[model samples]
Target: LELSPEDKELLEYLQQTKAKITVVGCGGAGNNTITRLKMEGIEGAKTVAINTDAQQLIRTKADKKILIGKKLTRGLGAGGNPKIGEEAAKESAEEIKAAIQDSDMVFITCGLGGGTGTGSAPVVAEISKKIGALTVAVVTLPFVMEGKVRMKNAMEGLERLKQHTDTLVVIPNEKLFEIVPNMPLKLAFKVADEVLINAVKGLVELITKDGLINVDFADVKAVMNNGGLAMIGIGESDSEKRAKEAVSMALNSPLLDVDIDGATGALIHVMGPEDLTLEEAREVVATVSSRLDPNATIIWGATIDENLENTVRVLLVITGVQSRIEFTDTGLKRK
Candidate 1:
């Protein structure tokens, strides 16, 4: 192979311009998500955990930990009040800015119900958006059993957060109940965390890594920026038509309720073994796109994972779609 001096310089520039991605976890559930993500190690991203409770911050695992509202809360915490969480963030705005600045992509994760996450997450979301990054928020609402007051606060926070984020993933708690009612009360929430994990990992991997036909940072910005009310669908299959089968399963199980038919943007990332055929990948794309509007912006990437063997995993990220689930007095109900 022969290379010119101009070509060599071009390759160096592409390699050096890595997108800066930061994942910020706010409050208790958010901090816990950070810990799990850190333990699993997400490539091309850094984790920052922000909380009002100094004690919890000590236990949280992240690349950087910032405790806000030291004087306001005195390390006691938000006391289940979103007002306190908002006040804490206002007081520590500078600290949050210092940790979050210069990111090309920012992901904010929190459970919306009580205290810091429900209260302060909107602050982080705003900061990231103001700093001009591609901001994405992943949040969970409270369960039906979690009480009306918690649900009320969650709904309020949800409305406020939608304003600042470029894209938002809202997962209601009871999907776990619908899926696994027999699961122990405590561990069910982790399923929501797993969803957040997949969302962040998938997006980061899509931008930072290479594909045969690449979906780079520019492609991610095109699909996700201001791509409202996002939801995720993940499916894996080892069958004969693995890619098509996986896409079908993924479309059926979006983590949140959304009408994909009206979706304005889509990021379809397919993972499979080295031997995956072009036709199998095309099957996935055609099946998914057939259901979406013709004008929708579609960006796709394929990862060659030798470990996948005959298996294929499909991650379907539908963006700019409207949430079809209606909020009611008692809980979320399908309309």
Candidate 2:
């Protein structure tokens, strides 16, 4: 494999800049999602998969794979025991820390309910934060049909994860049915993964690529810093009324269930044709800002390309909204 002159120059720039980012898939479901991202050509980050099950870890296409609980579970798995899952992560703490040490940002993805994902995800997020990286977690809760026990496990896991992560993006599995109605089991999960991939890729490109307004890494850190939880929404339209339509679609996306009226901070990225007018860009930002709280702080950027011709894409990353996590006398309530 020979590097072209342009490729060599970019490599040199990256090394000199040390702009490192890492994505860690923290269990079976998480590893599977990362595998899908790799197949879909996700770039600009180091990918890692961590699991107790050696067989499952071997199938992942991440740049690094870690097998935790080697002495306890012996690569068998946590067997639905979250305590075992926690111990497994503790056992491999040093290796996990090393994996994310140099990263400027870390994204963790996992499915909550059983063993490794429910147990180890928070531990990974904690380590990432301790090392001074901007940490964000995207997790999925179990379906209602999976029964009360799985839901209980998920709630407990969610509570633990919130304590360590800077921002949490939760996907309730029951809501996934609304996105891909009446699909087979495997295909349904794939659709879920695709949604997560798009959210991640959109945000990564916003900071990494050159844009007309240039919202850099510092801008993202400032917005996410106040985050307890955030919702990411993406939308695209090619109609004559593209700007408003795209903004409306993003705010009303099925993937997010929260109210956006009270958001304290927001980062909006608009990508459109090279001929995109300043008036159109202003309309898009104004539309989004109008929907948010009057006091909300907003940062925006634009990426214009000839290929986008008549098409407009919008991504909204909003933070500081109240979490919908409710607690009862007995335990946490399911949404």
Candidate 3:
């Protein structure tokens, strides 16, 4: 998609920057999550599947899959059965630390309602911060009717998870039921996964694509340190109007900042099942870019697949140098 005159200028300032992306998935969703991303053609990305069960790795397909010999338990610690969950969390944290040691930005996704996803994700996020990388989390919530125990676990996990990352985008299975018009569990998961993948793919594309946005890894990392995170997306509407509407609904009430001159670079990703016309896609870019500082830089990427179905999502991560800031308890234990 072609950037508007103003955004084009911003792109000139942002420039294309490369990033090492790691996809973390645990529990039942681990295998499918990796498969979906690959099937949808998310390139320049690495996948890490962590499960207590060794069979999960043997049964799964990925570029660098590893069976975490840890079992994430149910309920609180010390009272529950001693298993591999905690050990796996520790082990996965180390692996995540190593994988993104020099990464500019990182994307972590896990089905958070479960024991493993909830328990391990925070540790991983802490590692990402310790290594000085920008981190964004995409987590799933359990069904509302799943009862109080699961809900409690989710609540505690989310509380801790938010403290470690810049922002959290939650996809509740119950909420999806309302949106998809009484869909089955399988269908609902498909929709949820589509939403998750679209978000990730969109971000990756923005960071890698040229001539779209002037944003990249270094810029994102800078923002993480500056206590700023930009959550963005595009939609899969047939008409430009409908597509724009979808994007608008996704953002809801994103607080826009007018003074973005400090923004050094950016990345934009567009993902959906239907193909967006270059004009339509550029229009989406134009809409969001109008608010950015004219001097900002950007990198843009786009992905289209069966799941996205013509709807596109955009992620804008900006970077800038900060003068004085306090980040105590930002939740990282230095190694």
Candidate 4:
């Protein structure tokens, strides 16, 4: 008993604290996601958006907004220059830290290719890691239509961003083809925002609220702490085969093309109707289970939402997967 942990004194002191979750959206794309999440709504988390451009910051909304690098950018956008974005972050480091300092978990969401999103995301992640928060970054790569120059730049941002985050999920904007083949680019961007929104919201609930099947702070920490190269799969189905097909939709489009075969850990949050059956839950979870390694760390939980009468929604966050996102033409490939 010599290696005793916390005693009554510690418990009494710690009991005064509540869980802290901060979602920081950096730059233009990031800021838009935060604003949208505000509209859809979530609890037990704080929203912060940072940008170098005043006009961009003015129109976008969040719980908190900070305009960085005023001296360098002079209230202007970073002009698609990530280096300037990096310096902007360095200049405004203190304000970002103040927003994220005490978070139990920090989620950084951005579209990495050019400007503030590329530079500032990693800087905020670096602070979150230093504060010992569970840091996760869900970033989207520039679409192929955005062209070679931007895509090549996204790789550097990805390397830095992936390095700082405990877990990283990169969604290629081009993958919109899988979900909406005929939709316009503007519509596709909104769809991508919903993905990050669900990701941040689902994770916040896992620890803050008790579910029919609970997943606590300890469980998440075990799976995601420093769990690099993560993949997120999400799906919804309301057909006769809803239970099975829901996960089918989720797994079918991990077009970041990160292979799921040997993933080291996974967390699946299932949401469905009050009448959702135990066997259905089993089927949803089982499909994902069959796709993982034999000994992979896994946690699954279900929450009942009555409005989802005929539908089932599943968000799977899998850790330690390998990324094949790095392809040819200016791509030498990396970790």
Candidate 5:
């Protein structure tokens, strides 16, 4: 891997001026999601894959891959036992810490039903937090039809993950199925992965890429610091009604499953053509703020590109939303 002069300069700039963000994939589902993102050309962060099974880890394409529970599971797996996953993470605590050393921000992705993701995700988040990184976790829960035991495990894992990470973005797998009812199972999961991947990609671009209206890394840190949990919504349009349509579509997105009315803070990014007017940007901010609590804090950024022409893309990162798991659990219990 040879670095061109331009690449070296960009690397130097990232090291010196910007936040060093690390994306980590934990367990099987996490590894698969990160691998997919890498294949789709996600850049600007160091990607690492951690898993209990050596074989699965090998299949992952990341800058680094770690096989945990080598002694306990013998590189086989946790066999759906969370205790083994926890112990394996503890045994490799130092290695994990070293892997994420000096990261200003860490993003962890996993599915919270099985052993490694359920058990070790919290441990990984704790380490990232201990090292003074802003930690965000994107996790998915099991479908109700998977069984009661899986649901219980996912809920407990979500509880633990929330304690350690600054913001947790939860995707209830059932909601995913609802959104894409007739899609094949594998394709449905890929769509779910794209939801999280796009959010991360948009946020990273807001901070690292030059924009018409700059939103710095510090601004993002301040907003995330207020987080209980965060949800991401994105919308795009190329019509004359782009501004209003984009805002309304994002606000009504089913993927988030969150009410923005009572949010504590929000970071909104609008990316569009160089001809995108300040008035249009203002409309976006106003539309979003109108939906949020009167006292809620809002920060916004705009990126201008001639390549986009009349297209406008909007991304909303809303913080301090109540967890959907509570409401879903009630419904599950009644059934």
Candidate 6:
């Protein structure tokens, strides 16, 4: 992939501008994703919860939640119908494309093991690519304890999603057992959430924080050009040291650039009961944000289980291409 000086300069300029954000949640994860983002003070971020369950959408705290109409609803469980899944996938892709068209970036998350997440995620990734948006996928793999069937679906979905997105950060629910040693199911779930949150936080820091290399659209596209994917970690607590370290570690390797401006989208995943101070987290984000180009805009959100410990996670996808979209389509995609 060769980027001309103009491409590099333009990408640098884009990073400094205001960016529109689209957050999409598939299956049961939609509500948790929206709630967590609100808790994180994701001001002005647009939310789109995609599920056949209208009740789930209504209960969410997103700016706009769409009850996947009959066409998208599988009529089965959260996975929906295979045929409907395909249609929903296409619709979601169209929605994602529109969002990228109007916004500077896009972030996508879904409970990938089940039907809906499995069916729709690949479609979204492809659409994001077609539109030239920096795309990131934050997905949860099934816990082995959840049974082999669920794990199989999760694994397959992950592979499919990976093919189309710029970066893929995965959190295996089973890994929580290692982190927490031996914990109850409830506790294990909380730990799983923390894992997801950590990954998101790390990515966010890389894109928005200062004192670290910044990655603009050119860098992002460069990685995408190779279908590159990365892993990120997030941490939260009364002790800010761990969280800061986690952010540093996440940005360590690919040390792409000095800072990101005009960031277009952020995908956050939070689970567990960890109580996080939004002010403290924002301070970390601000540190990263200061380095961004003045024109950069950002859209951010989180996924959390209120019953678990306090935590926050962020995954960002920065893009170089400007979008071509209408506000209505963008809003509809998120809503």
Among these predictions, the greatest TM-score belongs to 1
**lDDT per residue as tens, model 6, 11-32:** 7786664345555656666346
TM-score of each: 0.90, 0.84, 0.67, 0.89, 0.85, 0.60
**Per-residue lDDT for 2 in model 1?**
85
lDDT of 2 by residue, 1-335 (tens): 69999999988765554347888887888888778767765657788899998998999998889999898899998877777888999899999999989899898888888899888999999899999998988888776667788788887888888899887767666666776677777777777677667666666666665567666567678777667767777778999899889888888876555677757888788889876766777888898888888888888888775557788888887877654536332233433
**Which 10 successive residues of model 1 have the least lDDT summed?**
326-335
User: What is candidate 4's CA lDDT for residue 79?
Assistant: 86
**lDDT tens string, model 4, 252-287?**
765435667757888888888887777887887888
The TM-score-based order of candidates, best leading, equals 1, 4, 5, 2, 3, 6
Q: Whole-model Cα lDDT per candidate? A: 0.82, 0.78, 0.55, 0.80, 0.79, 0.51
Between candidates 4 and 5, name the one with more favorable TM-score.
4
Encode model 3's per-residue lDDT on 272-310: one tens digit a residue: 444455665566556556645665554444445454554
Clashing pairs in 5: none
How many clashes would you count in candidate 6?
56
Name the regions of candidate 4 deviating beyond 4 angstroms: 1-18, 323-335
Which stretch of 10 consecutive residues in model 3 shows the poorest summed lDDT? 325-334
Q: Could you tell me the TM-score of candidate 1?
A: 0.90
Clash number for model 4?
Answer: 0
State candidate 3's TM-score.
0.67
lDDT of 3 at 277: 52
For model 4 the local lDDT of residue 11 reads: 62
RMSD of each: 2.7, 4.6, 8.9, 4.8, 4.8, 12.7
lDDT per residue for candidate 5 within 284-332, as digits (tens), equals 9999998888888788988875557888988888888763234343222
